Design a protein around this motif. Structure first.
Motif, PDB file in Angstrom:
ATOM      1  N   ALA A   1       0.937  -1.176   0.049  1.00  0.00           N
ATOM      2  CA  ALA A   1       0.115  -0.046   0.005  1.00  0.00           C
ATOM      3  C   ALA A   1       0.989   1.141   0.042  1.00  0.00           C
ATOM      4  O   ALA A   1       0.576   2.160  -0.670  1.00  0.00           O
ATOM      5  CB  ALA A   1      -0.892  -0.059   1.051  1.00  0.00           C
ATOM      6  N   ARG A   2       2.074   1.366   0.757  1.00  0.00           N
ATOM      7  CA  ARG A   2       3.046   2.435   0.882  1.00  0.00           C
ATOM      8  C   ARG A   2       3.755   2.693  -0.580  1.00  0.00           C
ATOM      9  O   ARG A   2       3.399   3.799  -1.006  1.00  0.00           O
ATOM     10  CB  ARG A   2       3.981   2.389   1.730  1.00  0.00           C
TER      11      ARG A   2
ATOM     12  N   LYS B   1       2.324   1.891  -3.567  1.00  0.00           N
ATOM     13  CA  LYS B   1       1.239   2.208  -4.270  1.00  0.00           C
ATOM     14  C   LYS B   1       1.060   3.785  -4.245  1.00  0.00           C
ATOM     15  O   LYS B   1       0.868   4.514  -5.348  1.00  0.00           O
ATOM     16  CB  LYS B   1       0.019   1.382  -4.274  1.00  0.00           C
ATOM     17  N   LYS B   2       1.185   4.291  -3.122  1.00  0.00           N
ATOM     18  CA  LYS B   2       0.832   5.609  -2.925  1.00  0.00           C
ATOM     19  C   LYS B   2       2.095   6.431  -3.408  1.00  0.00           C
ATOM     20  O   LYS B   2       1.804   7.330  -4.082  1.00  0.00           O
ATOM     21  CB  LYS B   2       0.834   5.836  -1.303  1.00  0.00           C
TER      22      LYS B   2
ATOM     23  N   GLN C   1       1.932   6.478  -7.194  1.00  0.00           N
ATOM     24  CA  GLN C   1       0.973   7.603  -7.687  1.00  0.00           C
ATOM     25  C   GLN C   1       1.580   8.812  -7.832  1.00  0.00           C
ATOM     26  O   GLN C   1       1.240   9.727  -8.836  1.00  0.00           O
ATOM     27  CB  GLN C   1      -0.137   7.287  -6.707  1.00  0.00           C
ATOM     28  N   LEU C   2       2.244   9.180  -6.593  1.00  0.00           N
ATOM     29  CA  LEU C   2       2.999  10.626  -6.759  1.00  0.00           C
ATOM     30  C   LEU C   2       3.943  10.596  -7.803  1.00  0.00           C
ATOM     31  O   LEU C   2       4.054  11.785  -8.421  1.00  0.00           O
ATOM     32  CB  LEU C   2       3.708  10.646  -5.424  1.00  0.00           C
TER      33      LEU C   2
END
Ligand SMILES: [Cl-]
Lengths: 16, 45, 45, 45, 16, 16
Positions: free
Chosen positions: C24-25, C27-28, C31-32
């Motif tokens: 999850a980290r 993916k974030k 995305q940035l």
């Protein structure tokens, strides 16, 4: 970064 | 008692497959970003 | 003997949760980077 | 019957280690892309 | 890359 | 993006 200052135009992204 | 162990296991295997599929998606997007940075750097130089 | 199997299992489940949180980290942050490349390309064009 | 459970488990553990190694590779490449975007933005500004 | 030469300004990042 | 419009030159990549 970029491969420990290797230069080389980016070193192909630090060798991928 | 152990029968339950087999089901929890099928469950762990299912979550593992989901994790592997997510990792495959991440790798494909990461490859697109690598390509995009390559295109922008070539434009700048 | 099987009792041990239940503990190793709680252990595998724990490592799985850690892997999911790490994904999850990732993916974030990915995305940035996608957003950042988008902003730089818009500036260049 | 449960002996099989121990082997499937060694198998799940093996796949978990492979997933963790892949995640470590992904994180290193993602960090290179973050650095690359940083260099291009500094050039543009 | 970029969606098999699709063009389109990047195709929204190869559709994300 | 970029940290909810934070600005700051990119906010260090949204704090990494
Ligand atoms: Cl796993």
């Amino acid at each position: 970064g970029x491969x420990x200052x290797x230069x080389x135009x980016x070193x192909x992204x630090x060798x991928x | 008692r152990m029968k339950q162990i087999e089901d929890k296991i099928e469950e762990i295997e299912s979550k593992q497959k989901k994790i592997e599929n997510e990792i495959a998606r991440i790798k494909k997007l990461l490859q697109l970003t690598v390509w995009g940075i390559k295109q922008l750097q070539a434009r700048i130089l």
